Amino acid sequence: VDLTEPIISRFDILCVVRDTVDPVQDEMLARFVVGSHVRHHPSYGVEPLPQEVLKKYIIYAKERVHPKLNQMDQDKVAKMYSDLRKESMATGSIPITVRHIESMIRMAE
Amino acid sequence: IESIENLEDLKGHSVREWVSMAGPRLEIHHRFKNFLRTHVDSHGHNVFKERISDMCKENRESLVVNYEDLAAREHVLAYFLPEAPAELLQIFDEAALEVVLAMYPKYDRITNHIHVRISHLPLVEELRSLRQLHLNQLIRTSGVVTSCTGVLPQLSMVKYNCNKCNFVLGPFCQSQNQEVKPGSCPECQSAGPFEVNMEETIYQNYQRIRIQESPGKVAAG
Amino acid sequence: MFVSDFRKEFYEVVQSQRVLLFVASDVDALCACKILQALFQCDHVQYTLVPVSGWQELETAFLEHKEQFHYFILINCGANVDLLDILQPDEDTIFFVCDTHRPVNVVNVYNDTQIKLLIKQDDDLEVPAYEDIFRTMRRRQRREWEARRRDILFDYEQYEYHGTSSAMVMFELAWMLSKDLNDMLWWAIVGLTDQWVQDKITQMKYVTDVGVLQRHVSRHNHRNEDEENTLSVDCTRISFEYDLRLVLYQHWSLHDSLCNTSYTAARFKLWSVHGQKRLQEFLADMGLPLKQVKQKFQAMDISLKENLREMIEESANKFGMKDMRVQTFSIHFGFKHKFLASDVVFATMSLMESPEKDGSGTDHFIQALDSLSRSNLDKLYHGLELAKKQLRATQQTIASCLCTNLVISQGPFLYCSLMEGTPDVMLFSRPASLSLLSKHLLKSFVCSTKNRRCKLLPLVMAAPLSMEHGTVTVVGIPPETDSSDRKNFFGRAFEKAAESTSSRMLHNHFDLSVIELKAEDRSKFLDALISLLS
Numbered sequence A: 001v002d003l004t005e006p007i008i009s010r011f012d013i014l015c016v017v018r019d020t021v022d023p024v025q026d027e028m029l030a031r032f033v034v035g036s037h038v039r040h041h042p043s044y045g046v047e048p049l050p051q052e053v054l055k056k057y058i059i060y061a062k063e064r065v066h067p068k069l070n071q072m073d074q075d076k077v078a079k080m081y082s083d084l085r086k087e088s089m090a091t092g093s094i095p096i097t098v099r100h101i102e103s104m105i106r107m108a109e
Numbered sequence B: 001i002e003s004i005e006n007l008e009d010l011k012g013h014s015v016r017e018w019v020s021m022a023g024p025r026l027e028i029h030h031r032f033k034n035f036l037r038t039h040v041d042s043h044g045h046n047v048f049k050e051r052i053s054d055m056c057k058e059n060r061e062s063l064v065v066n067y068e069d070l071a072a073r074e075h076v077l078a079y080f081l082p083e084a085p086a087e088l089l090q091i092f093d094e095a096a097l098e099v100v101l102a103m104y105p106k107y108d109r110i111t112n113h114i115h116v117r118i119s120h121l122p123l124v125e126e127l128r129s130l131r132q133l134h135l136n137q138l139i140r141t142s143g144v145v146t147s148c149t150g151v152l153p154q155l156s157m158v159k160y161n162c163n164k165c166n167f168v169l170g171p172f173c174q175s176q177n178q179e180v181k182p183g184s185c186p187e188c189q190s191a192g193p194f195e196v197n198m199e200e201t202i203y204q205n206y207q208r209i210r211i212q213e214s215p216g217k218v219a220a221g
Numbered sequence C: 001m002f003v004s005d006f007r008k009e010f011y012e013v014v015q016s017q018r019v020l021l022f023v024a025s026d027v028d029a030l031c032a033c034k035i036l037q038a039l040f041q042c043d044h045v046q047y048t049l050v051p052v053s054g055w056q057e058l059e060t061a062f063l064e065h066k067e068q069f070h071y072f073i074l075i076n077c078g079a080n081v082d083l084l085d086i087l088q089p090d091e092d093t094i095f096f097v098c099d100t101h102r103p104v105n106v107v108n109v110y111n112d113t114q115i116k117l118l119i120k121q122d123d124d125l126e127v128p129a130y131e132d133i134f135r136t137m138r139r140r141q142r143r144e145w146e147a148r149r150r151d152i153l154f155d156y157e158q159y160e161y162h163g164t165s166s167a168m169v170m171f172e173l174a175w176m177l178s179k180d181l182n183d184m185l186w187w188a189i190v191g192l193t194d195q196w197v198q199d200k201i202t203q204m205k206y207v208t209d210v211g212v213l214q215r216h217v218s219r220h221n222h223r224n225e226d227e228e229n230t231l232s233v234d235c236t237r238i239s240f241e242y243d244l245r246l247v248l249y250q251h252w253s254l255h256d257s258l259c260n261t262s263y264t265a266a267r268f269k270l271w272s273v274h275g276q277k278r279l280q281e282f283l284a285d286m287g288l289p290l291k292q293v294k295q296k297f298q299a300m301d302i303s304l305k306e307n308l309r310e311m312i313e314e315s316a317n318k319f320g321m322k323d324m325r326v327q328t329f330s331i332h333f334g335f336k337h338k339f340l341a342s343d344v345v346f347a348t349m350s351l352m353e354s355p356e357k358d359g360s361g362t363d364h365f366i367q368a369l370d371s372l373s374r375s376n377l378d379k380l381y382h383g384l385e386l387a388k389k390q391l392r393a394t395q396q397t398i399a400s401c402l403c404t405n406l407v408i409s410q411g412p413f414l415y416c417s418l419m420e421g422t423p424d425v426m427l428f429s430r431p432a433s434l435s436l437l438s439k440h441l442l443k444s445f446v447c448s449t450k451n452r453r454c455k456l457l458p459l460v461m462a463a464p465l466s467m468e469h470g471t472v473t474v475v476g477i478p479p480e481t482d483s484s485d486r487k488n489f490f491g492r493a494f495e496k497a498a499e500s501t502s503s504r505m506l507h508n509h510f511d512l513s514v515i516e517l518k519a520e521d522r523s524k525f526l527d528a529l530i531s532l533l534s
């Protein structure tokens, strides 16, 4: 990556996107892309919301709703964090610090 | 004042004086009151009952009217609105206050004036394209706010203590054009160093912004 | 046996003696204790006062003190159990019992030598006759009589409820002695208002008792005062008020009062996200600016306040809250001290049931008892702050329960449970606060749900109590209909379930409808309760 630990640890969600060859997925992706170019001309399974409805839903969810945590089964997450720290120390792939715990709480909320 | 069955026949006047005189003024007042009371959306829901109720729930003193709805429901008001915007907006504010105090009789404790705001006006203009033809007309523009003053108090209806006697000069309206000079005291004719009566003067919030063309709508260089 | 005349057969007896007061932990008990303390201090009666929070500590205190005292007074405890069997006294002690709990135990009623009940005979009392309860074809009829006894005595002992306030009883004693000070009348008012706030009595009985207290208030207000001769501002003035049902609304903002009052919170459904707009519609209908409504009431503009009560009633009537007013009382003294009886009730109650871990429950009793005297106004104001915190915690807990749908209809009764470690559960672990929480939550649930069936059910609530011994506190509440007579069967239903399952039920609180239960046995206990109520 060439980034360092203080900035890497500040990102809660850390995604890797690869462009490896896979012919069936390539065929489906090509069909989706060409279909998109057809659909948007000037003229997973589950279906999405319209984007207007999504924007209204987002602002309502952000401003009119406030989650509150009652319990989260502390043993599960504590053991997870402990051995995630062990494997991170083993491989050196990503620093885990203490921020990943609070990332868990944030993602649940 | 008899009801005027056709506002549209100006009979040689221009829109400004035509709506400034009493007959067409009362006709516009009644038409806007009826529009607010009876306008319904595509589902039949009375939209302005809901909007005024939300405004009075939240103590917001301002009522946004959709120009598309006004043009669809009451044509001549949409006709006169961009031609004489100050006059018709004053009349609309009066009518909106009447409707608001019909719905909520005690709202005078929260406000003394309802500002009718207009949205979705089709008269869109680019800042680079404004001409003398648009003067004293309701325009709609777009841009990026590049400067803002602090919210400053501005005189709106100002009263002055007389420089010698205890009399107070009558309410003078501030114009945005020039400083209001009091003149002379009608009790004694003195015209010396008059001073504002802060306690009896009515102020209004003022903020001067500078907008410019958005950087993606201006040409490069 | 019932004491016919409190002056002759109780007060003039204990006036010559050393006396031991056992006082229960509730505001009515505290007020009766204050009145009786004032009388004893007038007459130099060398009394000793012991707080008792339950049956076992009452037994412990009696075991400690039975050698040294021959006359005992039990305030808001003892009347609803067999005190002779519970305490095992010596043959020549005397137990005076001033207690609101009903029905009175038949052994207490028909014991003619040792138990003396300071209970008004004109209360809601229907005692079975002595021959129906106490002592071939002859033995066949004996067994038939015993069966009839079991039937009649179950019909008597089924429904538990509350009678006239002990503070009012002690004030009537003070009036008969003609040593009734204005602060004693205020303590009587606070006891009755404790009964009303905790919903231990019907609205009819509360209005009747208010009608009784109005005449005493008028007498005290004309002892040295009329329309042209008036006292110092130092002196206390008690006034009858047709005031608002909002809680503590003269000590915080009207917004907080509307949000944290049980009635308006339940009606506007403020636990829900949508309910705040209903409340804003109500305030806009009134025409109160939201800034003024959110400002503290003492700092609110005075032009909004001098018709606020009738404005509230007028808007509430067209919003469907037909009874926002309540007949109550207020006390003034000095320039700035003003309290409603509900305010003093909530402050003293919070000082008793405080969430503070420092000290002990008896220390919190002591704080509450001190706060009822005007030499401890700082304690009273501290109690008011604690009451604001308690009301806010109550609304947060109600919101959590309703939003998470912890209230589930278990056929005969609704059921709810607090969970260990969740917010404010330690505040509500104490049985009195838990009873108030369950009542408020039942009103909120009845206003929330749209099902006609659910609006008529009673409610059972559980909460954690112990981890060193692993137990829970369980309370039973009757239905929240306006037709309700404020009687419930859960005190006997709990023990019938407990004996049917042989559950580890412990019965320490003075109300039978509150119990302690081992956390493992709650499953079979609830199964027996569904089977029993059917």
Ligand SMILES: [Zn+2]
Binding pocket: B162, B163, B164, B165, B166, B167, B185, B186, B187, B188, B189, B190
């Ligand atoms: Zn002059």
